[PDB]
């Protein structure tokens, strides 16, 4: 399953990759509607004030342990957070149809795992605010939409998941 790793016994810090979207937060930022060849644009600014990290600590790994161990091997998100970064998406609505696009934040998934016998015994999780992602759909008041378009029930990555590790010491 998801706990079978081919690593010696110990504690590791893993970069699960950029591109993670969180469960059911799909439409928290709102959606945009346009039509007849109009171009629609949505963007943001992950200013430290807004974009805040999501911690999921365990007994062996508390918030601090997770942070320091992540910012030590990978991008120091605490420093980076002081410098505003923007991103936008644009799409042109079809000639005689309506377009709907909604935006949501993406994240980098970091994990702190306790390995024992090539199996994960404990797992802490951190989601560091990254940028954003938009989903579009053409429509009319007549179309029924697959509700999975609007809702994500389990955290997932819109890119390819990763597993870049480094055994923790001390």
């Amino acid at each position: 399953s998801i706990n079978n790793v081919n690593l010696a016994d110990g504690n590791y810090v893993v970069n699960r990759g950029d591109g993670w979207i969180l469960s059911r937060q799909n439409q928290n930022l709102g959606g945009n509607i346009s039509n007849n060849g109009c171009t629609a644009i949505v963007g943001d600014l992950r200013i430290r004030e807004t974009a805040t990290p999501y911690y999921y600590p365990t007994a062996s790994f508390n918030e601090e342990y997770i942070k320091n161990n992540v910012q030590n091997v990978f991008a120091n998100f605490t420093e980076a957070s002081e410098i505003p970064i923007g991103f936008e998406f644009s799409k042109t609505a079809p000639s005689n149809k309506s377009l709907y696009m909604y935006l949501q934040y993406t994240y980098i998934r970091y994990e702190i795992i306790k390995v024992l016998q090539n199996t994960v015994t404990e797992r802490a999780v951190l989601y560091v605010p990254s940028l954003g992602y938009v989903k579009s759909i053409e429509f009319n008041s007549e179309e029924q939409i697959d509700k999975n378009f609007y809702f994500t029930s389990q955290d997932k990555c819109i890119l390819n998941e990763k597993f870049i590790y480094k055994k923790i010491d001390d």
Binding site: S34, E122, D155
Partner: protein, 420 residues
Amino acid sequence: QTILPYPNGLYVINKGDGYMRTNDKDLIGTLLIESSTSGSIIQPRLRNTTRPLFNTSNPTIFSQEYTEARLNDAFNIQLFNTSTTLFKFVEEAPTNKNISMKVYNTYEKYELINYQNGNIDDKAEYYLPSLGKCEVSDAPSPQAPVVETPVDQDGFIQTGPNENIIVGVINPSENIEEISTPIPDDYTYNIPTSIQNNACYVLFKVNTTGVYKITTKNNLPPLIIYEAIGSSNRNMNSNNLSNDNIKAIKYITGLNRSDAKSYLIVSLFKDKNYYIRIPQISSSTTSQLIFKRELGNISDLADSTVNILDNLNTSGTHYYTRQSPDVGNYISYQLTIPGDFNNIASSIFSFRTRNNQGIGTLYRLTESINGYNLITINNYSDLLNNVEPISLLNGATYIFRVKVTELNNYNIIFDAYRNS
């Protein structure tokens, strides 16, 4: 105005995006874009302020702050009246004509309801500020004759794509209990005395993925089970249940009806967290919650409330009113035929339903030192009109599974008609 196949409690319904008020009350502006020119309207968030719209049927309890709290439990919305999210529209006019560009502010409509026994007793509508709507069309003629037109009725119209996403939230007035250790193959939970004062939820996770039978030692009161949405694949501890205070719950199966003697058979995955809602036990005798992993095709009932039928030793109709599962879902009935057991001794039965239509499956429940086992006796492609009788061995136990195919009413009526 349709049926809501859900148990009593609170629900937050995302009713869609693109909502705006009538009479252009949300019109930002209109640009006249001449041919070979481009026009643009922008919401640059030079100010992060936004103005949510709120409407409630009970200001005391369902206050705006309360509703916002529910919305947070359901979708985890952080910002209600601020935004740093920009939206802009751009349109170039053709060489031959002029274009009209109208832009409106919009809202996502979140509905908060207190659902009780197929009825909505309380309700609030929260309009979350959205990212606008833009209408482009051929510029109207400046000479177009003016038509006296009366203002429309005050209200909202939906502009976005059809959407209706239901999300249940833990009732904030009912406490949460927690079984710290992942439950093994067998487990008994003693329901705290607090249960005498109000219903509670019991948060837990199973150590091993599989099917489970869950119930109170007397199959009463009825239990309801939920899944903690998004709980899978986050923090984990083999020897301990990591909490995420996830208040968003997905109804699996269960009932509220007082006399629904029953037990649950559901498929549980170890990487997820679940909630069992135990109703208020108004008694001084300690109740219990028994968990048991089941091996075998008892899993055929996977995610279903097995209702134990009583008062069978009579003739004619035997109605059982229960909250109907949603189209595609199950609801089961267990029957121990009146009389003693000796293969030959039988009784004629005719299974039927009355409010909702569905597909039936009759199983013969059997025992083994390897758990249970179901033997398919027959299948029914029409329960609402079934007349085909079946003879069942007296003293034997059968389980009838119903798959709803048509949700016409809040309750599904099961009729275990006895012919002899």
